[PDB]
Amino acid sequence: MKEFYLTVEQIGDSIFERYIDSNGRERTREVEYKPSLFAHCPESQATKYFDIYGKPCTRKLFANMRDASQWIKRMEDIGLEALGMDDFKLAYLSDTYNYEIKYDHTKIRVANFDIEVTSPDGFPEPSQAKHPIDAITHYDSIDDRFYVFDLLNSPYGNVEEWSIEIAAKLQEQGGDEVPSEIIDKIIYMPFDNEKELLMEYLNFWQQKTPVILTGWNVESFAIPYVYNRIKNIFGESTAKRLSPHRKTRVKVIENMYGSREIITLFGISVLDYIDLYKKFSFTNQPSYSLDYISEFELNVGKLKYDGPISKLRESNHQRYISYNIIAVYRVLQIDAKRQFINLSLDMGYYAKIQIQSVFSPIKTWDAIIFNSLKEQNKVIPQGRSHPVQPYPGAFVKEPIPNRYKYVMSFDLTSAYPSIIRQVNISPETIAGTFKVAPLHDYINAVAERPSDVYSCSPNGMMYYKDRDGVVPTEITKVFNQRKEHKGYMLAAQRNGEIIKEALHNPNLSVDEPLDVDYRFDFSDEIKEKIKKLSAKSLNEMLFRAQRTEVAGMTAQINRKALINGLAGALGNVWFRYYDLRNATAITTFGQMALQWIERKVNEYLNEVCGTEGEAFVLYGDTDSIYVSADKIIDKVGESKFRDTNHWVDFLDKFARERMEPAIDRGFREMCEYMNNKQHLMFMDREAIAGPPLGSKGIGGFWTGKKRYALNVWDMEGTRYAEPKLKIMGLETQKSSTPKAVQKALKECIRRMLQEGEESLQEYFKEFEKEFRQLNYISIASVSSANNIAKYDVGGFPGPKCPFHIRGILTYNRAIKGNIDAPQVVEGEKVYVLPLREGNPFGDKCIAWPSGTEITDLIKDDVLHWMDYTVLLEKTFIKPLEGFTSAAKLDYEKKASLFDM
DNA sequence: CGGGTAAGCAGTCCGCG
DNA sequence: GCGGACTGCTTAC
Ligand SMILES: Nc1ccn([C@H]2C[C@H](O)[C@@H](COP(=O)(O)OP(=O)(O)OP(=O)(O)O)O2)c(=O)n1
Ligand SMILES: [Ca+2]
Ligand SMILES: [Ca+2]
Ligand SMILES: [Ca+2]
Ligand SMILES: [Ca+2]
Ligand SMILES: [Ca+2]
Ligand SMILES: [Ca+2]
Secondary structure (H helix, E strand, O other): OOOEEEEEEEEOOEEEEEEEOOOOOEEEEEEOOOOEEEEEOOOOOOOOEEEOOOOEEEEEEOOOHHHHHHHHHHHHHHOOOOEOOOOHHHHHHHHHOOOOOOOOHHHOOEEEEEEEEOOOOOOOOOOOOOOOEEEEEEEEOOOOEEEEEEEOEEOOEEOOOOOHHHHHOOHHHOOOOOOHHHHOOEEEEEEOOHHHHHHHHHHHHHHOOOOEEEOOOHHHHHHHHHHHHHHHHHOHHHHHHHOOOOOEEEEEEEOOOOEEEEEEEOOOEEOOHHHHHHHHOOOOOOOOOHHHHHHHHHOOOOOOOOOOHHHHHHHHHHHHHHHHHHHHHHHHHHHHHHOHHHHHHHHHHHHOOOHHHHHOHHHHHHHHHHHHHHOOOEEOOOOOOOOOOOOOOOOEOOOOOEEOOOEEEEEEOOHHHHHHHHHOOOOOOEEEEOOOOOHHHHHOOOOOOOOOOOEEEOOOEEEOOOOOOHHHHHHHHHHHHHHHHHHHHHHHHHHHHHHHHHOOOOOOOOOOOOOOOOOOOOOHHHHHHHOOOOHHHHHHHHHHHHHHHHHHHHHHHHHHHHHHHHHHHOOOOOOOOOOHHHHHHHHHHHHHHHHHHHHHHHHHHHHHOOOOOOOOEEEOEOOEEEEEOHHHHHHHOHHHOOOHHHHHHHHHHHHHHHHHHHHHHHHHHHHHHHOOOOOOOOEEEEEEEOOOOOOOOOOEEEEEOOEEEEEEEEEOOEEEEEEEEEEEOOHHHOOOOOHHHHHHHHHHHHHHHHOOHHHHHHHHHHHHHHHHHOOOOOOOEEEEOOOOOOOEEOOEEOOOOOHHHHHHHHHHHHHOOOOOOOOOOOOOEEEEEEEOOOOOOOOOEEEEEOOOOOOHHHHHHHHHHEOHHHHHHHHHHHHHHHHHHHOOOOOOOOOOHHHO
16 A cells, blocks of 8 residues: 555654555654755756746755754845745655555544543643543544543542443433443453553553544643643653653644643644534534534433532442543544544645644645645745735625515535636736726626736736646645535435435335435435335435435535635735735625626516516625526416426526526626636526415515525425525524524524414414523523623623623622632633523623533522513514514514404 | 634614704 | 614624
8 A cells, every 4th residue: 555644743853754654554753854945046057946936946955954944044134035845844745745645544543532530629720730630531443442541549539440231221220321332342441549540541542642633622621631630740751651752842822812721742633523523514503512512413412410520420430430431432423423534634635734734724725735836846935924904805785675585596606716717816827917997897898808818807917828827726626526525415415305205105114224325316216115115214314314415515515615715815914825916806806706697697687577677686695696586487477386396396497497508608708808717607506495385475585684584495406305494694593592592583484484474473472472481591692702801890890891791790700709610711602691680690691601501509590580571572572573574574463454 | 723804783882952 | 762983793605
């Protein structure tokens, strides 16, 4: 097999590399890598190295990496560009792996761990590490084993060994229901004292040194706690054994409002799963506790116990250890589903970076572009300093607030990367500027043609047409990978819909789920067999279809995120290829494209309908248009349709056969107008929306920009067994809105769109009547908590104090005295509730850490004093009044003459 | 901590005769 | 009360 790196580090003048050799074995080596860097040189000097602008360069080979670094400094003191890859480990990987990396994940050691630390005096600060580590579960992907390190004797209690037999048993048997599929994979090791546990853990770690290190909050808690605890007990050199090169550094993580400390373990690639999830999941959660995320992703129930976690070890050590094991398995289960580790490995190896660099799009792209250019013997410019400057982004059309009955939407495929490809936007393809007309003149095709030579953007930039730039070339490769996974994702989705349909008629038989590849559209034979299957089999197939779809979604959406990241990296000062001319060429072209095509679709449809000046395009945002299809439906007449699916087919056919070719011609003309390199504006139909045939549903509504709801029958070629709501921006979509309120508002919208005004007033009247019975958590608002200290004036609100911060200060006073009570963590999320006047808390609201029950000390009072009236009006009535006046209907029945 | 801009709504503060 | 300036937070793209 072809070798591949596992980790790479620079330590002084050595590269330290862990790798898989040609025989599949893990090795380590130290290499005294001699970097090269580059200077411009005279024309009449024979060279094969050229900067990206075609100017000749001489290569300077250095005795060691420290000499290259010092040289870089001296070149600045002189005032001359020191060209080339200044991150020497990236050049090493480029030199050592000069081919497309074929990796084998079964050879990569992936470690998932979680620790327990009993603490009587509140939260155990990792930087202090003053309490014993009393449990470690460490899963190893190569052995496929959970190694459990269990402390039996502690200053906080002596306990009995954990029992695997009780662990296996049902919760109803007094057991812990550790899942049976992992019971045989546990290797349990009890310890008589902490020193021995840790000494064994380090010996184990040495034998099985993680390549990828993950788990939940490992970077901010587990790793620094373990590192600091071992440091305190044994000294630094023993603690540095967590690094296979014995090198670590304390790294300061700075945000807008403060900082924290993490430990960098050289020769390990730490991918904290909480950070993986935040980057790759495309959710925004009320809480990031593992219990909350586990429940959301897997639908497994909260790990439940009596009393505080601080007393769990002594009161119930058995459950304590079982929950530590289960917590590690939960992360694995989320990964089996979401496939973020897999994704990280793909992108890291593709870019030829340290795997943990996948968190940085600037670093990922710096390495992709470096490797690409290195291939042609080209030399990358030096990074330069830039002042941060604002620049313009997308156009968004102001919709007329209203109900909209029949809606068809269209949207550019990979808008910004397509613009980059079409215009040929790249650092080294800039050819000059032209005299710009106001944008409006390009939109209406009255401005002078920008160039008869170069490919243009309406921001005034021109680009070469003879050759593709390195940015379009490399962005195209990732785009193609994206398109492939999206194909599998959509197939799995359409397959899901076939299964749902079939489920309306399950057969009464005992059978097995079919062995099929869900990434591919179900053939006729598979369709036939599906119609003969039981509900049990069908459900299992649905689950598998949805897993395949989730796998496709992770792969496609984060490749989209990567390529879109490049368009934005052109506008970040830290990017080697930062250039506001290119960042703006992209965003300005986009604004033009949207408005240009709005004009064309309008002209086209007015033509088809024999009208003039009618606005068919009601809305659009960035690269999308929403076309009113009322007139199209009416021209055939609702009477001619057999059912909802009949008009949906009609519109689908109209969009594909009439609208899309009209759209394509309009864009080809725009391409010629801008003299672009390649026509790449592909605007496919997204949504077909409307009310169910013969109902009183309103089908859709807009309240404003980025605020709308649509009843959707077909999305990108997926025909739904059941209509689906596409709701954007509204309170149902916000993590700040109470869960029960999201759910109630969603149902009001479903009723408005599918059933009508009368159904809506029915549901409202009932929700208003019963809502006070809802669990307090389900009706709490959610907010991030920044700058708690800034607004804290002796425990009371300072001037301009935010409502949610006020809530926290109210909380802090109510629990003052107790180091046992959970503290709100700065920068994390809180639940917020209003309090009725003259409550014992002395203020109008209270907030507490999100994803948790509020402590028992105050819970009773909170419940008694909760202001259901305020809460109702703010979270439910206000947005609902927003929706319904927009849609021009009433949530309460107005008096009529029939009342008499 | 980690590519970008546009834009909505909640809330404070204070004006608005 | 509303609305504008401003902060804070959170979306859509
Ligand atoms: N996080 C994001 C999301 C979007 N965009 C920009 C770039 C996108 O190209 C454009 C339109 O967004 P879409 O959600 O329509 O995404 P794409 O058009 O890129 O992909 P798709 O093919 O899924 O439409 O907005 C961005 O810069 N950053
Ligand atoms: Ca725990
Ligand atoms: Ca798009
Ligand atoms: Ca599409
Ligand atoms: Ca059947
Ligand atoms: Ca879009
Ligand atoms: Ca306001």
